[PDB]
Design a binder for this molecule. Structure first.
Ligand code: CHL
Ligand SMILES: CCCCCCCCCCCCCCCCCC(=O)OC[C@H](CO[C@@H]1O[C@H](CO[C@H]2O[C@H](CO)[C@H](O)[C@H](O)[C@H]2O)[C@H](O)[C@H](O)[C@H]1O)OC(=O)CCCCCCCCCCCCCCCCC
Ligand code: CLA
Ligand code: CLA
Ligand code: CLA
Ligand code: CLA
Ligand SMILES: CCCCCCCCCCCCCCCCCC(=O)OC[C@H](CO[C@@H]1O[C@H](CO)[C@H](O)[C@H](O)[C@H]1O)OC(=O)CCCCCCCCCCCCCCCCC
Ligand SMILES: CCCCCCCCCCCCCCCCCC(=O)OC[C@H](CO[C@@H]1O[C@H](CO)[C@H](O)[C@H](O)[C@H]1O)OC(=O)CCCCCCCCCCCCCCCCC
Ligand SMILES: CC(/C=C/C=C(C)/C=C/[C@@]12O[C@]1(C)C[C@@H](O)CC2(C)C)=C\C=C\C=C(C)\C=C\C=C(C)\C=C\[C@@]12O[C@]1(C)C[C@@H](O)CC2(C)C
Ligand SMILES: CC(/C=C/C=C(C)/C=C/[C@@]12O[C@]1(C)C[C@@H](O)CC2(C)C)=C\C=C\C=C(C)\C=C\C=C(C)\C=C\[C@@]12O[C@]1(C)C[C@@H](O)CC2(C)C
Ligand SMILES: CC1=C[C@H](O)CC(C)(C)[C@H]1/C=C/C(C)=C/C=C/C(C)=C/C=C/C=C(C)/C=C/C=C(C)/C=C/C1=C(C)C[C@H](O)CC1(C)C
Lengths: 154, 42, 208, 198
């Protein structure tokens, strides 16, 4: 397949890794009471490990010669879940954060003692401002088009 | 009360409460959807 | 405000805080931590105590009478504590979410007036209905004052509001006590009352 | 009394009820700028008209087919049915036709009245209306573009937009069209909601 990698569900090294992982935990479960707190905790993580391997298999990840799920970021549409849709989500959240911060800075820039509102947050103003980040992309686009995102005069 | 509200909004305390809330949120999210290497919904 | 200078205090002999001049219904000068030294915060907390006491009076009724009336064999209400999961015609989520929108709109109306007194009084469909009350927390209206029992000159009404708030403080403590009693023991409140009255010297919290 | 989305909250300063459908609803401060507002009123109108047409064509055929008059596919399937032409052919046709019409509309948004006249026949222009509601030939029955009439269009358009949101989310989590959803709910309501769906 892409870059010579093979679908983990059909790979052999990916399975071997899963069985080996599951094997060692089972050993930790032994030498204790069969239904003890520690034993119950070990069981829980065994089931968790089995779920993680099956989830990896289901999502169609690519496995190399070591059986480790490699991530493709070239833009192939069979793999947007690996980098590009999480990337769009990140860009959204980071723009939210930055836009809210910038909005706040602009709003408090007009007092006489603006540093007072920086070492001691005006939380009412901040809570009024936080939710504009939800629409930050449209606001920023229209601010760029308006020409008011970038300060002229500098 | 007013002054307690002020002090509770000083930068270090505001930021520790913010980051504790953020940590709680991320911890719970990964407690419900653990071992996530991708976005598998759409 | 009638600044009762010599009202009976919770701690006799000690001066009440300055922001508590007896203006509020049932003011006994109790604010050691000074949680209400701000006029806006004072107002907000007056609203909070009132709504808490009303909810808690409704809850104290709905806990203590059904089990005092099913202890005696009148009907068969289950234990108020585990009364949450005994299934009904639907699931808890459908009823909770349906009720949340229902309860939510009324709460929003209260917020609209708590933060802006007398700006939501009238009805959105038939604008001729006009909830009566002129004080925040005391909305009146045909809906909340059909009997008009306390629309008289501000004398009896002031002693009527104190009555409400005192019953309400008692109810808040009552409801919390039933929850604490139900967590510590494993019985019902009427059961605890009957036991402590059967053997007062020995059947108390110092029984574990 | 310009309408209030939240009875206890005052309305923003940039909104002054001049525009039809103004209920003081802009919590996120999206139109604090006049030019932003002027662009957004056009955006809302065109989105709402498209949504009206869209959920009309999405829902009305469904009840028409489910009461046994026509036999149309589901909207989430009708694209797969093959028609007299390839799908890509239809797509590029629509692309070229839409590109010319949208460009025209854009040129009038940017400079009102600059594209009123027919570019082929130099007679047959448009009467000087106002941006967003282009009268003339786009108004054959010649109804009165009254303010209350404009408000009705804005009110309906917003309802259609919410209806479309509902249609797509409903189909994504349920697995079927809108009318099947409604009849299957009102069949037994207390056990057919989102709670049971999720
Ligand atoms: C004032 C309103 C109200 C109150 C005080 C309670 C109180 C309670 N409900 Mg409850 N409910 C309330 C409304 C509603 N409930 C339900 C639906 C249910 C269900 C389905 C269940 C309960 C249960 C419970 C109890 C669970 C005890 C526990 O583990 O607590 C834990 C304590 C906390 C989480 C508090 C922690 C600190 C706090 C500051 C946060 C508890 C005493 C459960 C029950 O009966 O358990 C025996 C249960 O199964 N409720 C609905 C849906 C309409 C409600 C609507 O208003
Ligand atoms: C599902 C399909 C349908 C979806 C419909 C969605 C609608 C939007 C989501 C929720 C709408 C209801 C929000 C809660 C109800 C009350 C909100 C409100 O009026 O609360 C009041 C504020 C007021 O918003 C704006 O607030 C701005 C600034 O005021 C203040 O802003 C802050 C508010 O604390 C500070 O007070 C600050 O000092 C002060 O500047 C503007 O200048 C205007 O006053 C006002 O329009 O709305 C707010 O954002 C409150 C904070 C939540 C906003 C959520 C927006 C949507 C996300
Ligand atoms: C370093 C070289 C390079 C670069 C730059 C790219 C770039 C790209 N490749 Mg490619 N690729 C490469 C090398 C490269 N590739 C190589 C060497 C191979 C062979 C292994 C491939 C094989 C390959 C395949 C097989 C495919 C791609 C695809 C793609 C595209 C996927 C992303 C997309 O569709 O657009 C962007 C996606 C979006 C959803 C757009 C949303 C982004 C928004 C608009 C920006 C967000 C900003 C913010 C949140 C909001 C705006 C704010 C602002 C207004 C202020 C993309 C443009 C895919 C493709 O063809 O694309 C369709 C695909 O099929 N590539
Ligand atoms: C309003 C918050 C804010 C915003 C919008 C930006 C925006 C930007 N920063 Mg910056 N930065 C910030 C805060 C912010 N920064 C703080 C607090 C620091 C001190 C650590 C820095 C240190 C910094 C450096 C050293 C550099 C930038 C750079 C940049 C530019 C490139 C993006 C980047 O790499 O950032 C990087 C982001 C960081 C290094 C850390 C960000 C800190 C947090 C995430 C933001 C704080 C938000 C605020 C506390 C929330 C208050 C909201 C209110 C409601 C209370 C970009 C325009 C780079 C640049 O010059 O571009 C060419 C660059 O080299 N920033
Ligand atoms: C609202 C008033 C009220 C009343 C009338 C009662 C009555 C009773 N409680 Mg109870 N309780 C209350 C509140 C109340 N409680 C509150 C708020 C809590 C949470 C701390 C508790 C927690 C509690 C526990 C854990 C237990 C009881 C128990 C009991 C029974 C025996 C008393 C005892 O031994 O424990 C002492 C109870 C307390 C020290 C809490 C009382 C403190 C508040 C402030 C009430 C003060 C009374 C008030 C000032 C005067 C009442 C006015 C009027 C009705 C006379 C008894 C019938 C015991 C029982 O089950 O009997 C076997 C028991 O196990 N209560
Ligand atoms: C593309 C859809 C769209 C657009 C462009 C607009 C645009 C506008 N609306 Mg609006 N509205 C819509 C849909 C839309 N609406 C829907 C579906 C409803 C039903 C709930 C309403 C209900 C409504 C009311 C009650 C009011 C407005 C008002 C306004 C105007 C001021 C608010 C504003 O500018 O914010 C900008 C709008 C946007 C940036 C749209 C972006 C869509 C979001 C960001 C993404 C969708 C997320 C979704 C939840 C998933 C403005 C021109 C106010 C007004 O004065 O009328 C003119 C007014 O009071 N709208
Ligand atoms: C999607 C990713 C791509 C997005 C591209 C968005 C459009 C970018 C080009 C337009 C930028 C713009 O209009 O502002 C361009 C901004 C300045 O913005 C200009 O400001 C002027 C004075 O206020 C006027 O308002 C102009 O209308 C405005 O365009 O500067 C630049 O970006 C330099 C490019 C040339 C302009
Ligand atoms: C913790 C809550 C602190 C409450 C508080 O500080 O406000 C309450 C007051 C501050 O509030 C002030 O009170 C003064 C009289 O004490 C005056 O009445 C002022 O007008 C009032 O603003 O501070 C305290 O009394 C708390 C003392 C320390 C408690 C710990
Ligand atoms: C509201 C409430 C309870 C509501 C419960 C309801 C509605 C339950 C309804 C039910 O449906 C359930 C769910 C189950 C159903 O089967 C039955 C019922 C029962 C019908 C309790 C509040 C209970 C609230 C309580 C007890 C609060 C106590 C606060 C105190 C003591 C503070 C005092 C001070 O703050 C001052 C005033 C000044 C400061 O300076 C100093 C200090 C000391 C801090
Ligand atoms: C255009 C549209 C849909 C168009 C659909 C079409 C053409 C369907 C076409 C077809 O069906 C046919 C006919 C036949 C089928 O066989 C095939 C398809 C192809 C299926 C929906 C828009 C849908 C648009 C939607 C849902 C918009 C939602 C906007 C919201 C909620 C914004 C609210 C706020 O913005 C305010 C108002 C104020 C801000 O301050 C705060 C917030 C909260 C942000
Ligand atoms: C703790 C404990 C323990 C032990 O063991 C046991 C016991 C004994 C049980 C306990 C105790 C308890 C208690 C104390 C309780 C109390 C309560 C209360 C106070 C209530 C009130 C309660 C009160 C109440 C309800 C009241 C109510 C009122 C009302 C409805 C009114 C109404 C109305 C109005 C508005 C208006 C109009 O015009 C008139 C009318 C229509 C008429």
């Amino acid at each position: 397949d892409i870059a010579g990698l093979t679908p983990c569900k059909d790979s052999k090294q990916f399975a071997k890794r899963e069985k080996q992982s599951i094997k060692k935990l089972e050993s930790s479960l032994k030498l204790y009471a069969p239904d003890s707190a520690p034993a119950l905790a070990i069981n829980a993580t065994i089931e968790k490990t089995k779920r993680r391997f099956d989830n990896y298999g289901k999502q169609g990840l690519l496995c190399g010669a070591d059986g480790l799920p490699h991530l493709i970021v070239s833009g192939d549409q069979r793999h947007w879940g690996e980098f590009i849709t999480p990337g769009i989500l990140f860009l959204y959240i980071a723009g939210w954060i930055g836009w809210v911060g910038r909005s706040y800075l602009i709003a408090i820039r007009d007092d006489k003692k603006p540093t007072q509102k920086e070492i001691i947050i005006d939380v009412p103003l901040a809570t009024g401002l936080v939710f504009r980040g939800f629409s930050w992309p449209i606001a920023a686009y229209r601010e760029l088009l308006n020409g008011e995102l970038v300060a002229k005069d500098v | 009360m007013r002054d307690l509200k002020t002090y509770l909004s000083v930068a270090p305390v505001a930021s520790t409460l913010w980051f504790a809330a953020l940590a709680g949120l991320l911890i719970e999210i990964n407690r419900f959807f653990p071992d996530a290497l991708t976005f598998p919904f759409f | 405000t009638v600044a009762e200078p010599d009202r009976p205090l919770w701690f006799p002999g000690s001066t009440p805080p300055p922001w508590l001049d007896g203006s509020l219904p049932g003011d006994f000068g109790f604010d050691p931590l000074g949680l209400g030294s701000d006029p806006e915060s004072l107002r907000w907390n007056v609203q909070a105590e009132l709504v808490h006491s009303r909810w808690a009076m409704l809850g104290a009724a709905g806990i203590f009478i059904p089990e005092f009336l099913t202890k005696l064999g009148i009907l068969n209400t289950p234990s108020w504590y585990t009364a949450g999961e005994q299934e009904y015609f639907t699931d808890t989520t459908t009823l909770f979410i349906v009720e949340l929108v229902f309860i939510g709109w009324a709460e929003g109306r209260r917020w609209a007036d708590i933060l802006n007194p007398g700006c939501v009084n009238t009805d959105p469909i038939f604008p001729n209905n006009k909830l009566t009350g002129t004080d925040v927390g005391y909305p009146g209206g045909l809906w909340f004052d059909p009997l008009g029992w306390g629309s008289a000159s501000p004398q009896k009404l002031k002693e009527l509001r104190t009555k409400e708030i005192k019953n309400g403080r008692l109810a808040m403590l009552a409801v919390m006590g039933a929850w604490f009693q139900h967590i510590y023991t494993g019985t019902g409140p009427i059961d605890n009352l009957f036991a402590h009255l059967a053997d007062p010297g020995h059947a108390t919290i110092f029984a574990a | 009394k310009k309408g209030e989305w939240l009875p206890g909250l005052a309305s923003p300063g940039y909104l002054t009820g001049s525009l039809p459908g103004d209920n003081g609803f802009d919590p996120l401060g999206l139109a604090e700028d006049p030019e932003n507002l002027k662009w957004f009123v056009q955006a809302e109108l065109v989105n709402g008209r498209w949504a009206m047409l869209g959920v009309a064509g999405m829902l009305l055929p469904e009840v028409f087919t489910s009461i046994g008059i026509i036999n149309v596919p589901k909207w989430y399937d009708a694209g797969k049915e093959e028609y007299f032409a390839s799908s890509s052919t239809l797509f590029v046709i629509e692309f070229i036709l839409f590109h010319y019409v949208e460009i025209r509309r854009w040129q009038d948004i940017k400079n009102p009245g600059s594209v009123n006249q027919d570019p082929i026949f130099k007679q047959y222009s448009l009467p000087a209306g106002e941006v967003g509601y282009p009268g003339g030939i786009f108004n054959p029955l010649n109804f009165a573009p009254t303010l209350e009439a404009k408000e009705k269009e804005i009110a309906n358009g917003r309802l259609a937009m919410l209806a479309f949101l509902g249609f797509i989310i409903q189909h994504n989590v349920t697995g079927k069209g809108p009318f099947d959803n409604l009849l299957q709910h009102i069949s037994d309501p207390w056990h057919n909601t989102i709670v049971q769906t999720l």
